[PDB]
């Protein structure tokens, strides 16, 4: 398995082709959710302290697919590596 450095979350995206009704959307209209697989220790602060992350390994998280989101190939699985800054929420 992979290791995250400093503050990085490793996530795998999910899904959907359809909408609210099952009405299939076109690839102008139609993902921002994913599952946490590995988490870094935390950010290192100017005072030397290491702030832990508020995302545990195995949350369903809503993230911003920004510039800082990078893509990787792991065991032939599509994964994403982003900083915790790019995570917006959790689904509990």
């Amino acid at each position: 398995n992979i290791r995250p450095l400093h503050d990085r979350v490793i996530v795998k995206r999910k899904e959907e082709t359809k909408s609210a009704g099952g009405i299939v959307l076109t690839g102008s209209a139609a993902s921002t959710r994913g599952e946490v697989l590995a988490v870094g220790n935390g950010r290192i602060l100017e005072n030397g302290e290491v702030k832990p992350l508020d995302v545990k390994v195995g949350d369903i998280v809503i993230f911003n697919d920004g510039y800082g989101v990078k893509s990787e190939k792991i065991d032939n699985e599509e994964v994403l590596i982003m900083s915790e800054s790019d995570i917006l929420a959790i689904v509990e």
Binding site: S19, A20, G21, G22, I23, V24, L25, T26, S28, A29
Partner: protein, 181 residues
Amino acid sequence: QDELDVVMQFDRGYLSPYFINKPETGAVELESPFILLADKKISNIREMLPVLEAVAKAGKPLLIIAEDVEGEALATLVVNTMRGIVKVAAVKAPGFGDRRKAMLQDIATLTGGTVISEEIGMELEKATLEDLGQAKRVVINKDTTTIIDGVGEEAAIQGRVAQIRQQIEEATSDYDREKLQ
């Protein structure tokens, strides 16, 4: 030998040739469908979702007679009937300018639907099954669209007719008389 064919119809074909549900005639035959009358021209599938939803959970097919059905919102509609999620047709509106809105309104009266006119404070999303017209059958080919026997009440129809009948009275020009009758 000589031959007579008989049918409301107007000069507009399907926008999407991938809708023909009977390749025998090369035409779309929508059985007992709903009818959406959009004054504005459609380009995004967002606007459709609310109404498309209620038609998808109603079972009945749907005819969409708007100013135009643009690619982004057309593309989708195709793959939805392609698969059998909803049965939908898309055809341009009969006419040009103020005559189009006038004719588009005629269809609403024959079918018991509401013209979803963007100009007079209506969004296409805030339409429901309420605002859709209905007909006994619909037939559309490469050139013409035909609505056979609409749900609209004959009171509203003949009221709408005796109105257009007196529009031809005040027609001081021959051309204004042609298109009215």
